[model samples]
Target: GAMNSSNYAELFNNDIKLFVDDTNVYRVTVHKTFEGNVATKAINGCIFTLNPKTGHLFLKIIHTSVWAGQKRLSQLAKWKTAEEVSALVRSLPKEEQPKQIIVTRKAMLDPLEVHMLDFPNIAIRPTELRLPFSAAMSIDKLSDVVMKATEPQMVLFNIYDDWLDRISSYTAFSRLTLLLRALKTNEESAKMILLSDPTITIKSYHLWPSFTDEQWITIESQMRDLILTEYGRKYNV
Candidate 1:
């Protein structure tokens, strides 16, 4: 196997700082690390949870550098700029140390997703939504073509990347969705992105209304029940 795996959190398990959590809540608190040329940031210290029902994952990045700039703007279900990220971070609960607790809710799905991976990581069953090698010279350009078009409608161009070699367009979209969720600005914070597909233009939904502490507790209990009934797994450690 390669020296490391794509599971960024799991790959460096030894380096991660474990925290106390309830059975249903999968909470992790990680230390600071650099972001390319930007300053360091921590997970849980800032984080996001995705609605497993839909193809949406969330990211709550605190200490988000690069986004450390001043302020910015946008419209029409726009993408959250770096400055926006900072704005959201600033709006975060000050009582806690810049904690962006994430939450997600989805009824169900069609293609079905591989739920093995938790928040910020997603996988979808491959369907027809894809650009053949002809349309997309390679995964690199393929991602660029799709990523470049903030909108959903996509044609194709050649580009390549190792991760894209086998991953589907849906997966790419899901991956992109989480990043956007994490980078979401204050104004665009309420809305959530829809599932990604090669032929589909990117879309968004205004669903997130946030949760109360009681709601979080109830959700956790429900998750615990669902896990035991569906997967026959038990928790509470």
Candidate 2:
């Protein structure tokens, strides 16, 4: 429906943005506009991605006009906050069944909704949600938080980087080792995708002590084969 701007006399302005996708998800945000005062002018809202097909609610609470102080927190602290969402989601059974629940970032769950879990009889299937690759190799606190959140399930790390030097930094290597150690103690399998970085010349065995010479060679061979098979691309031999 279309109408001219002058078709109405007095009105409060409201606008929304929405999208439809095959993720069986509907994501949208609405804004309400005010007339005079700038301080109390507009109301920004939460962006919600709801999957009715699976009873999944992925939300990003927007505090548009409020102080953005929390957004400045350290990456690990921010990630730690994100892990709390899963804990809340899993505890929903006492109040829920989603058959299955999937969160895109595993960080967007809301604490308010978490408390409301007691009011519903929802059940959730045990599953791992998609997570950022970089978060897997952040500080140990956040790294271990992500691992524990996806308990009993093997996790995959995408060791993709555009800058060769950054990826090879001692901090990055240490984080990788720490995460691997955590994965081992947690009794979970690990998978990695070494993509986008072609400047790597060092061997995995050199980086980590556990990979025997034979095992290292085999892993390297597999990676090379993968590159060739996927896109007919060649790598350093």
Candidate 3:
């Protein structure tokens, strides 16, 4: 399939903040300048009515203005030490590849191509749901395990739409916590946990400058490239 979607994350499209709050719930925030302040009350009310059970249990503070969202992608360690990310990056493009890749302001964001560079086999798909989660770990902790292990074999799956399908039925943070707990308890299980875009949750409340299905698919493809990059780095293949 032909594609023109740049293999780079632009500064504006960069952030999709992910945080595990004090309550062990996820707070994912994406800032879009176009969504202004005047309608704050109206928007909240509509979402509130739509979510009777949420009742501030899952607190996602939506600060206003695109300027509010201007918290550009933070340059930080991806999985573990910044050096690990650096190592994964140098492995990029190989020294002989034709085109060089630049890790831009946006490129340095989470799930950066290099984050998955050391994993030899990984996939984000439906069948993943069939397996019982034996264990779970955060990206940071898992990185440490991978670094020390003789053979770090695990399935790193970001919880996506399948759970969402039943989520009108749920508010994910607790479930996410349960998954991580499993990982920590049994590290030998070789499993890692990840959540989907914060926007997906916000949309269940109400659309906030969200992307279309086509756009999500494009983002998905880029992510697929990122993991493949990880496998390539693992074997120097």
Candidate 4:
């Protein structure tokens, strides 16, 4: 009937966490937090019941206050490192290695984002992700990857394309980068913005203790003028 098939799109929002454990069985639960001791809240919060002989496992969580979960996991003696995990995986027979050997937290967290970022064209180069790129690289081996390349103009162009690829699912970190790059390019009529407030600036990546709305509007306006003066020709038309 129509020239082509079409479907509408919208965001369905909910908070949930899913993971596969040592046995490779998947568990799904909403984010829930509990205060004070983990033992007191074990009945209500995410709990894992494990038995090796039967290959049985159970997990439960309260579905509120999810941010403090790592603290709880520490108290429960369940938190473990890659070395421990590798040893456990080796205990399984070679034939079952594929299913029994998941390096969950040690290898990756946030599987969807991590997998998408692993792609060739869609993935961002480490340098672009760590703005103040070289300066931020000195901290660790992983960060050192951010210092590998030169030619930042080329880097910016690559990041611009990569940003678009995942814009629909952008996080706060990604959004900050997009904002900075847009202003740097002096692109006219960019909808979103950030500015050098007395308290907030990209020079130091601290935007916490958010400024007042009046201060925010003033900062935004000043930034617009500055970008228009510098980069207006790039996209003003």
RMSD vs true structure, all candidates: 21.7, 22.5, 21.4, 20.7
Worst 10 residues of 4 by lDDT: 2-11
lDDT of the candidates, in the order given: 0.26, 0.31, 0.28, 0.29
Error of 2 at 143 (Å): 28
Number of the top lDDT candidate:
2
Instruction: Give candidate 4's TM-score.
Output: 0.23
Q: Give the top-scoring candidate (TM-score).
A: 4
Deviation of model 2 at 132, angstroms:
8.4
lDDT of 1 by residue, 1-237 (tens): 112124323312222111111111111334555654533231112222222222232232222232333243111001222222334334436442122211121111110121212222222222122211111111222223333433223131111122234555445334433333232221122122222223333222222222344543453344344434434322342
Model 2 TM-score, 2 decimals: 0.21
Residue-level lDDT of model 4, residues 60-111, one tens digit each, is 2222233235453432223332222333334547543322212223222233
lDDT of 2 at 42: 20
Cα distance off (Å), candidate 2, residue 111: 4.5
Clashes of each: 13, 7, 8, 6
How far does residue 159 in candidate 4 sit from its true spot (Å)?
16
Stretches of model 2 off by over 4 angstroms after superposition: 1-48, 52-61, 67-100, 105-113, 124-126, 129-237
Candidate 4 at residue 42, lDDT?
Answer: 23
Give the candidate order by descending lDDT: 2, 4, 3, 1
